[PDB]
Design a protein around this ligand. Structure first.
Ligand SMILES: [Zn+2]
Lengths: 356, 109, 179, 58, 102
RNA sequence: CACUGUCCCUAUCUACUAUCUAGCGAAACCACAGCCAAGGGAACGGGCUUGGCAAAAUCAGCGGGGAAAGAA
RNA sequence: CGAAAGGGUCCUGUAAGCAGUAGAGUAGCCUUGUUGUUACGAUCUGCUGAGGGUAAGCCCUCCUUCGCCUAGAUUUC
């Protein structure tokens, strides 16, 4: 196997970290650089290809795409960083008032019996003098910090998971003076940010998650055979992987009610498969359609971030046009996209006649 | 809310005996019924009817029915210095089909 | 693209669904799933399998002749593109599909017409030799209602009410052994 | 009650697989230690010899 | 929604659709779509009998075994007083008239 | 001439173990000990030199070391 | 939150029973049968894409029903 992923141990945290934000220049406009979502599953699409030089040019190609459910992240914080000879140091974290109970669940291991007193005194310094402690801490970021980040969390009630604990993550602001991005961060407090605003269609993005765990296995499957370099048994899976150059094929709204409808098939249907996603449920929010395979199991939190470098391929500058999206049953050999055309194909059944 | 209460339940043993070794399904179904009445009535002292044991073992050791329908009766254990003050008695009931039947309380009067 | 139809059973074969077998004489067979393909390779006749649409057409379980099914067909002479024609085509298939469903439902009611009367005659025969298993009221209940008759004036209807109650109204095996 | 199962087999002239003892009268069976005390309980109905198993030839 | 638009493409489709709607008018007029207690009670009565058959059949399986076993005759076993008054009461019999208390 | 996981190229399923618990409960073996590298004339280190280093207590795998020709 | 149920989605392939001289064939009645009757009867057809299963690592729940819940032990600046 590769010696680059040599410490084949379990990932230290379930969420998995970005480890590198894009290099920042002040001439760019102010923008965020990452987001979070939940893995729903995969489907099948047909894309009308426009690849000059390809054998499938101006033809129909069937591709596998991955659906990531993206409820709108809520911005709750702002973290400033300074440059050091020892590295990079966090100087000041500024939160907001009216923190939701979802992110408050994150700072507790037993929420059901706690007194829920987190950030109770922090809510009082917003009205202590006039907010002097809050404004002082922001001015400390403006005059001393070299780059600032945004604390945003996802909501689990919009997602069909039995979890109630939100996922809290730091997202870097790029493209501007430190004064400009701080005024973004304070203005963005208590506000939902959609995936329509962070990313866009036809864009390579970077996907970060923890892979599927397989427990203790031997050298037959852990290494792929017939000190560190010697193939030895141990843990396979639950490793942190950063994947590169995955195209955003679609960004659904969730309100639209015709998410799986294209300009060529005029069927008013959504992205959720007929019968539901297996072991996930229904996607009722914004979703991101990612081409190809993507790490992590279903229901797992997905971290999407911008590409670090300017792209060097025509695959990134390709406009994607979808002809149709599969919506048939994941639970078997489904030959029906919607409920309506199954009853149209089948005809009247016995239970339908007895009920009516 | 009463200590003495009799209710009738349906146990989906098909989902509780999925993938079990064939020669342990009838013994494990007895333990899953005991685990069922312990959770549903809060009583660790659970007694099963001998005719309920006949229904479980009706089709052999590997032929437990998918759905059994029983009555669980919480009664007061008087005894003399008993460890627990309540117990649940489980009996199989006679129905045409153990499907489509909701949980219901049976009135003694 | 084109929604294909399965050779074996006739459900719609969408892209990337199933397999296609090409024979040496030039004929391609499109299948929707592995069940249809495996039954083809062991050379079973789909007109005999009751889940295939070839059997249902052969047995008369859906009708074949009427005007709306003649209106859909595979076209080998293309037409020039016309936006007015394509928009008015779409409104036609909305009308076409709902006319089919309202004629499918009439066809199913016509096949099930004899089922309704036959079931009541069979149940009429089944009651006439099983009188002893009917609801009958307990002797203690007829005793209670004997006293009540005198009190409120009356007996006959009283019983009919509590027998209607008994119909409007499950025993457990075994019982606890006293220690 | 192993002694009573053995003595009832000799009194009734059958095997121990055909000797049936009353589950509700175990205290009365236990006091029976003679072949005359068991002959009491056979006549009273507390110890009963089971019949031959069905062996339908049809 | 499950159909191929190119299959349904045909010129003079207004003439075909108008003729179909004229057929739909003729089918409405002569009534191709119109819908046209003693039987109810005896159906419910038959349902009660079919339930009693299953309850008797289930109680037969309660006494039966998979393999033939030697069983105690009913003349040998002793039956409780309360079971006789219970069963005859279902049969609708005055249990106090027969002085069932011997 | 026909088949075949022999292989391309491997995947999957079952039972008993392996795992954990309650009870019961040995033996082999044992100077003292166990991280490496260079040097330690007698091609001989594990204890010396001088470097790399070096942080309690533990649970599972392994197949390396703690083993080996003797010179006409 | 849990157990059932309902609906959906899939898997298999048309349940038990009832009925039709469709029905090969097997047999009793009286007498010529050109159209004789009477019973049983494999098989077929219909009720019936029915019936069964469906999360155990599928999906949803409008008052779908029933139940449970502010437990109790240790440790900590
Ligand atoms: Zn098919």
């Amino acid at each position: 196997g590769s010696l680059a992923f040599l410490p084949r141990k379990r990932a230290a945290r379930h969420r998995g970290r970005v480890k590198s934000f894009p290099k920042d220049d002040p001439k760019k406009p102010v923008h965020l650089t990452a987001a979070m979502g939940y893995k729903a599953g995969m489907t099948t699409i047909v894309r009308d290809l426009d690849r000059p030089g390809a054998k499938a040019h101006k033809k129909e190609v069937v591709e596998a795409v991955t659906i990531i459910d993206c409820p709108p992240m809520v911005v709750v914080g702002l973290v400033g960083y300074i440059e050091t000879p020892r590295g990079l140091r966090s100087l000041t974290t500024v939160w907001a008032e009216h923190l939701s109970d979802e992110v408050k669940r994150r700072f507790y291991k037993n929420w059901y019996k706690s007194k829920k007193k987190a950030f109770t005194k922090y809510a009082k310094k917003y009205a202590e003098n006039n907010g002097a402690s809050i404004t002082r801490e922001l001015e400390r970021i403006k005059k001393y910090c070299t780059v600032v980040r945004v604390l945003a969390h996802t909501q689990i009630r919009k997602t069909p998971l039995k979890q109630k604990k939100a996922h809290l993550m730091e997202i870097q602001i790029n493209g501007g003076s430190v004064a400009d991005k701080v005024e973004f961060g304070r203005s963005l407090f208590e506000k939902p940010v959609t995936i329509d605003t962070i990313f866009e269609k036809d864009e390579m993005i970077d996907v970060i998650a923890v892979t599927k765990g397989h427990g203790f296995v031997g050298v037959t499957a852990r290494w792929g055979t017939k000190q560190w370099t010697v193939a030895r048994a141990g843990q396979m899976g639950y490793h942190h992987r950063t994947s590169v150059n995955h195209k955003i094929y679609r960004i659904g709204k969730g309100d639209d009610e015709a998410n799986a409808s294209t300009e060529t098939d005029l069927t008013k249907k959504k992205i959720t498969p007929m019968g539901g996603f297996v072991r996930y449920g229904e996607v009722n929010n914004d979703y991101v359609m990612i081409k190809g395979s993507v790490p992590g199991v279903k229901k797992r939190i997905m971290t999407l971030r911008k590409s670090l470098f300017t792209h060097t391929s025509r695959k990134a500058l390709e406009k994607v046009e979808l002809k149709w999206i599969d919506t048939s049953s994941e639970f078997g050999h489904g030959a029906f996209q919607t409920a309506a055309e199954k009853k149209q194909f089948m005809g009247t059944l016995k239970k339908d006649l007895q009920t009516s | 809310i009463a200590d003495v209460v009799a209710r009738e339940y349906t146990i989906h043993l098909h989902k509780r005996l999925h993938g079990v070794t064939f020669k342990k399904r009838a013994p494990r179904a007895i333990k899953e019924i005991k685990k069922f009445a312990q959770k549903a009535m809060g009583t660790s002292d659970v007694r099963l009817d001998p005719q309920l044991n006949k229904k479980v073992w009706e089709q052999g050791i590997k032929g437990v029915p998918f759905r059994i329908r029983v009555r669980i009766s919480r009664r007061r254990n008087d005894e003399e210095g008993a460890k627990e003050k309540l117990y649940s008695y489980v009996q199989a009931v006679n129905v045409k089909n153990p499907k489509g039947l909701l949980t219901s309380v049976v009135e003694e009067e | 693209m084109r929604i294909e139809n399965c050779f074996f059973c006739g459900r719609p074969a969408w892209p990337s669904k199933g397999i296609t077998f090409m024979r040496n004489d030039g004929k391609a067979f499109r299948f929707c799933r592995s069940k249809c393909h495996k039954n083809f390779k062991m050379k079973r006749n789909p007109r005999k399998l009751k889940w295939t649409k070839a059997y249902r057409k052969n047995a008369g379980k859906e009708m074949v002749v009427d005007s709306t099914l003649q209106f859909a067909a595979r076209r080998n002479v293309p037409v020039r593109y016309n936006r007015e024609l394509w928009q008015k085509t779409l409104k036609a298939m909305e009308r076409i599909s709902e006319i089919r469903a309202r004629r499918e439902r009439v066809f199913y009611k016509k096949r099930m017409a004899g089922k309704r009367a036959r079931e009541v005659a069979a149940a009429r025969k089944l009651v006439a030799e099983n009188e002893h298993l009917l609801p009958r009221l307990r002797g203690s209940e007829k005793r209670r209602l004997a006293e009540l008759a005198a009190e409120r004036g009356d007996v006959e209807e009283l019983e009919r009410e509590e027998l209607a109650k008994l119909a409007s109204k499950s025993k457990a095996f075994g019982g606890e052994v006293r220690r | 009650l192993r002694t009573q199962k053995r003595l009832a087999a000799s009194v009734l002239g059958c095997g121990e697989g055909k000797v049936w003892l009353d589950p509700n009268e175990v205290s009365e069976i236990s006091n029976a230690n003679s072949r005359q005390s068991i002959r009491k309980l056979v006549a009273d109905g507390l110890i009963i010899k089971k019949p031959v198993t069905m062996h339908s030839r049809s | 929604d499950g159909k191929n638009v190119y299959d349904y493409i045909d010129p003079d489709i207004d003439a075909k659709l108008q003729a179909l709607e004229e057929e739909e008018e003729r089918l409405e007029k002569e009534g191709f779509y119109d819908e046209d207690e003693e039987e109810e009670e005896i159906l419910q009565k038959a349902e009660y009998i079919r339930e009693q058959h299953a309850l008797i059949r289930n109680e037969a399986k309660m006494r039966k075994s998979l393999k033939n076993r030697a069983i105690i005759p009913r003349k040998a076993v002793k039956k409780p007083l309360s079971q006789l008054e219970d069963h005859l009461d279902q049969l609708g019999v005055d249990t106090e008239a027969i002085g069932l208390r011997a």
